[PDB]
RNA sequence: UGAUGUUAGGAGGGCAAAUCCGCCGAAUUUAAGCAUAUAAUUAAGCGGAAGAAAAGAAAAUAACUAUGAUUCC
RNA sequence: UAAAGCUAAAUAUAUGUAGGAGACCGAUAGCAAACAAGUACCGUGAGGGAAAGAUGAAAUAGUACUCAGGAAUGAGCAAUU
RNA sequence: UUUGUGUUGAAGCGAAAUACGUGAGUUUUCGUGGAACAUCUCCCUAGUGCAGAUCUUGGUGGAAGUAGCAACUAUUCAAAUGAGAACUUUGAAGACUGAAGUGGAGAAGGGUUUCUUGUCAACUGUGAUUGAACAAGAGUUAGCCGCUCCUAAGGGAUAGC
RNA sequence: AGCACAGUCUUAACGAUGGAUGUCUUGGUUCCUACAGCGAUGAAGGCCGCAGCAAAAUGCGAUACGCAAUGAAAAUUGCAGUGACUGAAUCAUCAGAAUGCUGAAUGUAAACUACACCAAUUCCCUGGGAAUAGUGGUACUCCUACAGAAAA
């Protein structure tokens with residue numbers, strides 16, 4: 001008709017399928033299934049597959065801040081006793 | 090919309106804040122080269138994607 | 140290096156180390172040669188140049204002129220002498236930057252810190 | 262401007278009193294900056310560092 | 322003997338994978354066509370560890386004048 | 395001499411981190427990325443994914459002054475090198 | 476490996492030569508350029524020689540000052556501002572929408588486009604002093620309006636299997 | 637003061653447009669050597685904040701482009717400021733202290749800064765004196781003790 005399968009029916013196209021996702025922040029949380037299409041939030045695991053090398057490296061260990069792990073290096077060659085302190089003066 | 094949630098409105102405020110130009114005195118520094126912010130957004134042209 | 144394999148002789152690596160040196164290491168790089176008279180009084184051959192020392196210019200367009208160092212700029216790798224000046228196109232006056240390795244120093248300003256250095260350097 | 266070594270001999274009560282007066286001074290400076298009186302906008306840095314030092318001594 | 326207990330003291334859960342352990346499991350392709358065969362005890366899928374893992378002290382070879390736990394070249 | 399159990403070395407390492415090196419590439423090449431690069435941007439979504447290096451020894455030399463012009467800009471007997 | 480050129484100007488590039496060679500090519504002059512360049516004495520080595528592949532990436536033409544800048548009835552006189560007004564503002568005319576309105580108020584979607592002041596490099600497919608463009612500051616006040624509570628078509632879980 | 641027809645095509649000299657060529661390189665690539673996991677004592681990842689004037693990247697966490705301590709050791713800057721005649725201005729090291737909301741996420745929920753139950757909680761002097769609706773605990777499975785109750 002007048003809202004045919006091209007320009008006409010694109011005008012009816014409000015509404016949302018996805019929104020922001022808790023646990024990964026992407027606009028990939030199906031609001032009606034209640035499940036993330038990227039990280040799979042409601043379940044305990046992470047949802048990554050071996051047929052996508054490119055995707056697998058956009059969200060790996062070294063792509064973030066590494067808040068706690070980065071302070072844990074170079075202890076292996078200082079090897080101080082916990083609670084110690086350098087000599088005063 | 091006029092009806093909003095708390096988090097979404099905070100995100101809108103944050104995205105409005107980041108749409109400002111570089112400070113002028115920062116240009117008078119040495120060791121600096123940044124003339125203008127390469128990430129600038131206009132409301133009618135690029136959608137936030139929310 | 141020449142005979143120890145645990146340090147590099149690569150142009151890339153140590154040309155990178157020169158231009159990103161931490162500010163503490165830059166003062167050892169900015170060192171000048173001692174005059175003959177100061178080389179008998181002290182056993183040392185060269186020292187890091189400090190503010191209130193006195194110098195003689197040995198290379199460049201301003202060779203032969205003497206004066207006192209008034210400022211040190213560790214980020215540009217240059218020093219400034221008291222009566223070696225310049226005119227900008229405005230007419231405002233500035234200093235000409237001299238590289239410390241183009242200079243021999245003829246008089247020190249000693250204090251507690253340099254004493255303990257000149258003692259060990261003997 | 263305070264130094265940590267001059268604080269180690271104080272008691273807890275007066276350490277807290279010093280923290281309180283530092284906080285009052287910082288609040289006054291912020292209030293003054295809120296109005297267009299930028300005469301003393303450079304003093305905030307020192308007061309912030311002093312607060313940090315006092316809290317460090319108290320917590321240790 | 323099951324159950325109950327916000328009783329005291331403790332453990333498991335998620336991330337990461339180049340090398341390692343266990344399961345599950347194709348077709349493209351080659352045969353100048355194609356069905357067994359090949360691709361391959363492979364790719365994709367699901368679980369479990371370490372600075373290595375797995376294997377390992379004969380219900381083993383030989384047929385000699387006899388050798389002698391496992392691994393690798 | 396089966397149907398129970400433990401055990402180091404010689405072996406491997408397209409991951410992470412640190413060090414050294416080559417008859418290797420030289421900005422359409424070499425990793426997608428020599429630069430605020432898995433960034434800008436596109437897709438409802440799973441995903442897709444660039445372009446972009448070089449003044450001079452020194453700008454602690456980045457263009458002062460005059461004339462014309464609303465300005466932009468142009469010219470000079472004027473000016474840094 | 477041998478033995479050579481360069482701030483008294485290298486490589487590169489433009490125009491050339493009473494020059495050499497059957498030829499691919501060597502060699503030299505003048506100009507620009509401002510820091511590196513050869514080896515033919517003999518050997519080694521390879522991502523080693525382009526006119527085409529509706530080849531790949533980038534740049535540029537004739538067509539050409541050409542096709543075109545036609546829905547929505549319609550404009551005119553005077554004044555202000557300004558470097559500059561057919562399309563900024565004021566007054567006077569002639570007209571339209573005609574309550575099933577380019578009138579009022581909400582939802583989905585957008586996210587500061589809202590307001591006041593300033594202002595024109597680019598944009599506003601003609602002009603532009605206008606603007607939803609650009610810049611600097613502001614603006615959203617609830618016991619009674621809503622969510623929040625109930626249950627629906629339905630979704631996710633527990634025990635067991 | 638005077639004299640070349642116009643267009644089209646060809647060749648020189650000087651320019652416009654464009655970014656090849658040569659020179660450069662704090663970047664890639666491959667090989668060799670050494671070492672090796674993190675997490676309920678809350679990880680990897682995500683969000684939100686922090687500077688006198690402060691968008692991105694980098695760094696940090698209500699002590700927030702940095703505190704304390706140790707080694708050097710006068711400057712650091714656009715302006716304003718801050719520093720010695722060496723726990724101070726800056727660089728490095730990094731063992732003490734501190735480390736927002738989340739996330740396996742674990743009181744119940746989640747396009748909510750929504751809603752429970754239990755214990756009121758935290759300081760200062762040396763038993764007093766104060767402050768605060770603020771703090772902590774509560775998932776499931778399993779092991780060793782323990783506790784009482786029940787059947788037999």
Ligand SMILES: [Mg+2]
Pocket residue numbers: 005
């Ligand atoms: Mg269709």
Ligand SMILES: [Mg+2]
Pocket residue numbers: 017032
């Ligand atoms: Mg739907």
Ligand SMILES: [Mg+2]
Pocket residue numbers: 090092
């Ligand atoms: Mg909405």
Ligand SMILES: [Mg+2]
Pocket residue numbers: 133
């Ligand atoms: Mg639109």
Ligand SMILES: [Mg+2]
Pocket residue numbers: none
């Ligand atoms: Mg066949």
Ligand SMILES: [Mg+2]
Pocket residue numbers: 353
């Ligand atoms: Mg065939």
Ligand SMILES: [Mg+2]
Pocket residue numbers: none
């Ligand atoms: Mg066939």
Ligand SMILES: [Mg+2]
Pocket residue numbers: none
């Ligand atoms: Mg596999």
Ligand SMILES: [Mg+2]
Pocket residue numbers: none
């Ligand atoms: Mg596991």
Ligand SMILES: [Mg+2]
Pocket residue numbers: none
């Ligand atoms: Mg073993």
Ligand SMILES: [Mg+2]
Pocket residue numbers: none
């Ligand atoms: Mg056995």
Ligand SMILES: [Mg+2]
Pocket residue numbers: none
């Ligand atoms: Mg075993």
Ligand SMILES: [Mg+2]
Pocket residue numbers: none
């Ligand atoms: Mg290399």
Ligand SMILES: [Mg+2]
Pocket residue numbers: none
């Ligand atoms: Mg490239």
Ligand SMILES: [Mg+2]
Pocket residue numbers: none
């Ligand atoms: Mg050559």
Ligand SMILES: [Mg+2]
Pocket residue numbers: none
């Ligand atoms: Mg040169």
